[PDB]
CSV table of C-alpha atoms and ligand atoms in Angstrom, one decimal:
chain,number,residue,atom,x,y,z
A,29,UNK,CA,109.3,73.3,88.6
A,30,UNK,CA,107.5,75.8,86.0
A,31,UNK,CA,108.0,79.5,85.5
A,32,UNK,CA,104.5,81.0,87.1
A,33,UNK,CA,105.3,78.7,90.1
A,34,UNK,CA,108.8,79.3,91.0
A,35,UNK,CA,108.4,83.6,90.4
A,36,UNK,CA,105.9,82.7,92.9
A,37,UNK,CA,108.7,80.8,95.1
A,38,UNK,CA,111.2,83.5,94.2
A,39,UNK,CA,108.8,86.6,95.3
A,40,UNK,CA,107.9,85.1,98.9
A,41,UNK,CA,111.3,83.8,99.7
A,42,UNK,CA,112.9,87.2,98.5
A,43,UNK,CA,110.4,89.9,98.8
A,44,UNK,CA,109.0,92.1,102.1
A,45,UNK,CA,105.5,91.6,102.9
A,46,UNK,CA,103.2,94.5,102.5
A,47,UNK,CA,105.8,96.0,100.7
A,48,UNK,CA,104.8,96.1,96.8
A,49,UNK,CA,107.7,97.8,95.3
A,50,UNK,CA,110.1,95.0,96.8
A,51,UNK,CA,107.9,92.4,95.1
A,52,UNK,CA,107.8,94.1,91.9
A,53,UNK,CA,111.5,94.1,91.5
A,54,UNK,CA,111.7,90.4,93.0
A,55,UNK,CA,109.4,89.4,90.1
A,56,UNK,CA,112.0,92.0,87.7
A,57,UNK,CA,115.1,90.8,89.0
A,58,UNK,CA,114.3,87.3,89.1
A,59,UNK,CA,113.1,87.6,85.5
A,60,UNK,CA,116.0,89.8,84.0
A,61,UNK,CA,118.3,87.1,86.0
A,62,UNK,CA,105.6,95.3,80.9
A,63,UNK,CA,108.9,95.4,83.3
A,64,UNK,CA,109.9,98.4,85.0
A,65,UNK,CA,110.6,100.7,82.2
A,66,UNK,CA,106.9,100.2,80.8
A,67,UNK,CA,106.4,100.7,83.9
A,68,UNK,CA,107.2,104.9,84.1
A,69,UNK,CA,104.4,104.9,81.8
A,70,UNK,CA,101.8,103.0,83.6
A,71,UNK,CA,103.0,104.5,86.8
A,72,UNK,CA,102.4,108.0,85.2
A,73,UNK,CA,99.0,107.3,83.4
A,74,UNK,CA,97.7,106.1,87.3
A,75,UNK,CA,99.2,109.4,89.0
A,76,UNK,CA,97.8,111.9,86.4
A,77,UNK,CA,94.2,110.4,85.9
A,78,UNK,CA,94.0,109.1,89.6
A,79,UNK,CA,91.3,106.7,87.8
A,80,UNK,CA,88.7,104.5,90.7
A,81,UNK,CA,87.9,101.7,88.5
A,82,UNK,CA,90.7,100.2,86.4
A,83,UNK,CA,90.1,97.0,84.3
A,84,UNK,CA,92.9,95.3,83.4
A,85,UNK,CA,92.9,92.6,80.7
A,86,UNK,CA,95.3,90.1,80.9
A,87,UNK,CA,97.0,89.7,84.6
A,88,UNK,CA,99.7,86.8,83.9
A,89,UNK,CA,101.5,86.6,87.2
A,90,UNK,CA,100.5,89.8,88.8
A,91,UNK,CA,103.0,92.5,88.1
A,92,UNK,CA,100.6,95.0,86.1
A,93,UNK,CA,98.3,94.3,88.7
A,94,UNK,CA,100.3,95.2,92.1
A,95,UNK,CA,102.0,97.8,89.7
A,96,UNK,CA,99.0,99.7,89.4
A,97,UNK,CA,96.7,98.6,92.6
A,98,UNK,CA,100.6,100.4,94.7
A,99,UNK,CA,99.4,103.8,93.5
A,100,UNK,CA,95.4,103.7,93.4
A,101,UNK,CA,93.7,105.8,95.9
A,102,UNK,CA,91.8,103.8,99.1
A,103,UNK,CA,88.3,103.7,97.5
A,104,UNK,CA,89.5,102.4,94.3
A,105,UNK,CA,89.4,98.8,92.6
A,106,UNK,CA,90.8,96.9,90.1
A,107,UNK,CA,89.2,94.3,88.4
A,108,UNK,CA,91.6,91.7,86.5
A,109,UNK,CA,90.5,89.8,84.0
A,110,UNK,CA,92.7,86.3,83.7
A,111,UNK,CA,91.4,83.2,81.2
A,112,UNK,CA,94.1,81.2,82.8
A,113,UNK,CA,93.0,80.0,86.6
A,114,UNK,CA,96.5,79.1,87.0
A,115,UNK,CA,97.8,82.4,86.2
A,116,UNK,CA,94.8,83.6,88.3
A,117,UNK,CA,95.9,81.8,91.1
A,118,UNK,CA,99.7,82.9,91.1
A,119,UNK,CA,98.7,86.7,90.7
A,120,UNK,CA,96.1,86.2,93.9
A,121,UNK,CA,99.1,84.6,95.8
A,122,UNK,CA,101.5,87.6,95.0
A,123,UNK,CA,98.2,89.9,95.5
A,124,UNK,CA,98.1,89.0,98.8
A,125,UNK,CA,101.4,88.9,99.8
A,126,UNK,CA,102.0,92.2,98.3
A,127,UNK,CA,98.8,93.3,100.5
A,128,UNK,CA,96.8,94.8,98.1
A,129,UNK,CA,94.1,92.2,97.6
A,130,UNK,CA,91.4,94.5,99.2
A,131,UNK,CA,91.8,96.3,95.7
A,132,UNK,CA,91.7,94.2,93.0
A,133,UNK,CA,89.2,91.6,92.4
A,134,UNK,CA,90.5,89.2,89.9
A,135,UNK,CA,87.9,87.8,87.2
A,136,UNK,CA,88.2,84.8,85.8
A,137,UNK,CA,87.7,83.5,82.2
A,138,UNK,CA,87.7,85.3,78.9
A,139,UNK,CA,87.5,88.6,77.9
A,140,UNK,CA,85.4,88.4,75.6
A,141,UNK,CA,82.7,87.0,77.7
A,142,UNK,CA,83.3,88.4,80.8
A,143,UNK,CA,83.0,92.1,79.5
A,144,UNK,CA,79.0,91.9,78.9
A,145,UNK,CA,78.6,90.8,82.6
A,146,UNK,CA,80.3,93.8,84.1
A,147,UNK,CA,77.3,95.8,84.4
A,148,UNK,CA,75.1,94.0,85.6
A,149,UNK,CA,76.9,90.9,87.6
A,150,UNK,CA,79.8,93.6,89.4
A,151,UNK,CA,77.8,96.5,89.7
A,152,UNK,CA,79.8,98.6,87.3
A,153,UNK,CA,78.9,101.9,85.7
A,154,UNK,CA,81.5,103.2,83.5
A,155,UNK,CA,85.3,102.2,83.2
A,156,UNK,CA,87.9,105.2,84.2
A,157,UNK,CA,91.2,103.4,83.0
A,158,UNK,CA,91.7,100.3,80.9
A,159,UNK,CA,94.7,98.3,80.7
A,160,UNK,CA,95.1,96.1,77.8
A,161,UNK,CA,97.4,93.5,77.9
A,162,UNK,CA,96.0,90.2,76.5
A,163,UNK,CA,95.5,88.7,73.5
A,164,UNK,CA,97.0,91.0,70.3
A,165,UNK,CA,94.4,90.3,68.5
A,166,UNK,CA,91.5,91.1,70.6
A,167,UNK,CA,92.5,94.7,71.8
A,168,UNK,CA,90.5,95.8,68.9
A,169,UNK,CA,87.6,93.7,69.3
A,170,UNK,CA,87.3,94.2,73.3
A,171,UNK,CA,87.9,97.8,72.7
A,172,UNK,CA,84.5,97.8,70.2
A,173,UNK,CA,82.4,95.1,72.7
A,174,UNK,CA,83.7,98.0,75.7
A,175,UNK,CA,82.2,100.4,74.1
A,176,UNK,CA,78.9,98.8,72.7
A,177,UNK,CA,78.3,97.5,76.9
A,178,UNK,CA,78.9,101.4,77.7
A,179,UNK,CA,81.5,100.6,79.6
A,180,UNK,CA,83.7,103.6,78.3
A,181,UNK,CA,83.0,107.4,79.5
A,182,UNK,CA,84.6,110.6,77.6
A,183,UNK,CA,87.6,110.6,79.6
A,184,UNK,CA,88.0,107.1,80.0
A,185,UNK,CA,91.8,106.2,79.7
A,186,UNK,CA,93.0,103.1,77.3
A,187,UNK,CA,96.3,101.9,77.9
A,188,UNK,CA,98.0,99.2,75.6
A,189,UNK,CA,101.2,97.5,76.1
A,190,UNK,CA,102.9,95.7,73.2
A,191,UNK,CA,101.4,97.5,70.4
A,192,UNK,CA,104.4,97.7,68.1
A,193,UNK,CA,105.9,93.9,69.3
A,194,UNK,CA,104.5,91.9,67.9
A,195,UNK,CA,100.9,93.4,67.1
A,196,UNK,CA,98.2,95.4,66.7
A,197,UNK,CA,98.4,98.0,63.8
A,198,UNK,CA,94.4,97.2,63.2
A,199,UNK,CA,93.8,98.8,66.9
A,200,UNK,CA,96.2,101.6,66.5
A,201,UNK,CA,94.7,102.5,63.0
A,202,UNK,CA,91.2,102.4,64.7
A,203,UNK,CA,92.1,104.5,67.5
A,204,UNK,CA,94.1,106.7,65.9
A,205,UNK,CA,91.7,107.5,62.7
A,206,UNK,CA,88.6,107.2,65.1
A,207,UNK,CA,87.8,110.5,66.7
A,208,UNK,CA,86.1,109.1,69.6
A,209,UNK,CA,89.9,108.5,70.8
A,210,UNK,CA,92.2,111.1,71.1
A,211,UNK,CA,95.6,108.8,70.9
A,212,UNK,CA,99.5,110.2,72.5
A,213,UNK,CA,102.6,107.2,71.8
A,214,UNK,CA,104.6,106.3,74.2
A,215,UNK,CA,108.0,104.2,73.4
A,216,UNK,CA,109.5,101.4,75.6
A,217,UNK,CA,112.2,99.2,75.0
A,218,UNK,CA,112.7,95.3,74.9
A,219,UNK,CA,115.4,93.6,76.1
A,220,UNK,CA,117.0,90.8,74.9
A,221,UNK,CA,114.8,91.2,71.4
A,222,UNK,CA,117.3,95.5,71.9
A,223,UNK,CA,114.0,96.7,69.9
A,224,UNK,CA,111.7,99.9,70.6
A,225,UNK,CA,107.9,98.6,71.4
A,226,UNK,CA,105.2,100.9,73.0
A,227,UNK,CA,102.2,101.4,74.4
A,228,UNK,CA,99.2,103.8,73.5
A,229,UNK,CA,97.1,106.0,75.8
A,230,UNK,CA,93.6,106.3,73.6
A,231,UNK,CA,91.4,108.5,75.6
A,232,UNK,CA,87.4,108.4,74.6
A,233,UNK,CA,86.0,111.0,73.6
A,234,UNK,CA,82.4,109.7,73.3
B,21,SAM,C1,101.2,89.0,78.4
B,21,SAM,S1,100.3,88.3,79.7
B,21,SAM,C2,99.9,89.6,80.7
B,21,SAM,C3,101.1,90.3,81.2
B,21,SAM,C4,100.6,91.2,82.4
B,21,SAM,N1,99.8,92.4,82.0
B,21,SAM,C5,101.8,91.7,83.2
B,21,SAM,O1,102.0,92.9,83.2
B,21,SAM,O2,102.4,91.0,84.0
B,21,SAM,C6,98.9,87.9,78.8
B,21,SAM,C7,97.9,87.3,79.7
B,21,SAM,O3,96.5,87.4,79.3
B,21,SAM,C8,95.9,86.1,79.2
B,21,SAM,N2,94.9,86.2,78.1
B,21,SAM,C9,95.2,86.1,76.8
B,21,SAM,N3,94.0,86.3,76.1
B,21,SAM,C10,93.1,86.5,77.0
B,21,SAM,C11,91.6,86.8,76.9
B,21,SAM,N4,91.0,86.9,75.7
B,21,SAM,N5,91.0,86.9,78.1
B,21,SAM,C12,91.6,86.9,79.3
B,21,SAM,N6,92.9,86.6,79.4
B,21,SAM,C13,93.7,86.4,78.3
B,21,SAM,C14,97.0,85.1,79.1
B,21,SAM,O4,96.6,83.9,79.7
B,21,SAM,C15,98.1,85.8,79.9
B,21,SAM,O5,98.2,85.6,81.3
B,22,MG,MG1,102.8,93.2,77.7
């Protein structure tokens, strides 16, 4: 009937339970029919930082999410911010069957305003990885509101997708000419668009 709801469909007829790499290429063989080639790079950034708390921004049908919750360590969590509770409800659903809800808590609503309430509503001290995959045009403005909450620690990890196609030249030029970010490139590809995107690791630096 709609796209989010039959991936949904696709993953639990087609997929393993418990078995998260099967459901990540149910949702990226259904779809070809950030996919697995952005997903190297996310796969590495996880494996070299080993980060315990990873907010993700933007979780549209759970693929980032179990991408990343897969390789975090047993402590870890994830906390995924998604403004659409329908989108929300689909990535719970393949959460669960992928068996990685103990991991990720999934927040609900906009970035923008839930951000201020991590402190002091979910108990958070400071952020070791952030995913950025929402809006283009907030990635800057989150970024700056991240850092005024002192969410971010020297060390903390940025990572954001799509950054290149379409958007987000203000956020690179920030990053980049900012020296509380030490900023690496990474390129990916897109496929039916055959152009080069990418993603960018910024790294605070206080
Ligand atoms: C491109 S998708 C996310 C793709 C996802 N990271 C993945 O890998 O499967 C963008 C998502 O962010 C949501 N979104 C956009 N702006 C947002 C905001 N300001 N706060 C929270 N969610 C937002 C959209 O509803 C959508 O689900
Ligand atoms: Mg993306």
């Amino acid at each position: 009937d709609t796209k989010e709801q039959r991936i949904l469909r696709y993953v639990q007829q087609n997929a393993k339970p418990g078995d998260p790499q099967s459901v990540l290429e149910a949702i990226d063989t259904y779809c070809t029919q950030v996919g697995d080639a952005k997903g190297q790079i996310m796969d590495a950034v996880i494996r070299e930082y080993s980060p315990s708390l990873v907010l993700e921004l933007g979780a549209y049908c759970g693929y980032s999410a179990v991408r990343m919750a897969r390789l975090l360590q047993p402590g870890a969590r994830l906390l995924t911010m998604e403004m659409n509770p329908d989108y929300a409800a689909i990535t719970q659903q393949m959460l669960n069957f992928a068996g990685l809800q103990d991991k990720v808590t999934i927040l609900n609503g906009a970035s923008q305003d839930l951000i201020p309430q991590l402190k002091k509503k979910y108990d958070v001290d400071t952020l070791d990885m952030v995913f950025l995959d929402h809006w283009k045009d907030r990635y800057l403005p989150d970024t700056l509101l991240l850092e005024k909450c002192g969410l971010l620690r020297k060390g903390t990890v940025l990572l954001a997708d799509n950054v290149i196609v379409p958007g987000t030249p203000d956020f690179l030029a920030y990053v980049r000419g900012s020296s509380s970010f030490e900023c690496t490139h990474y390129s990916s590809y897109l496929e039916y668009m055959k152009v080069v995107d990418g993603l960018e690791k910024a790294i605070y630096q206080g």
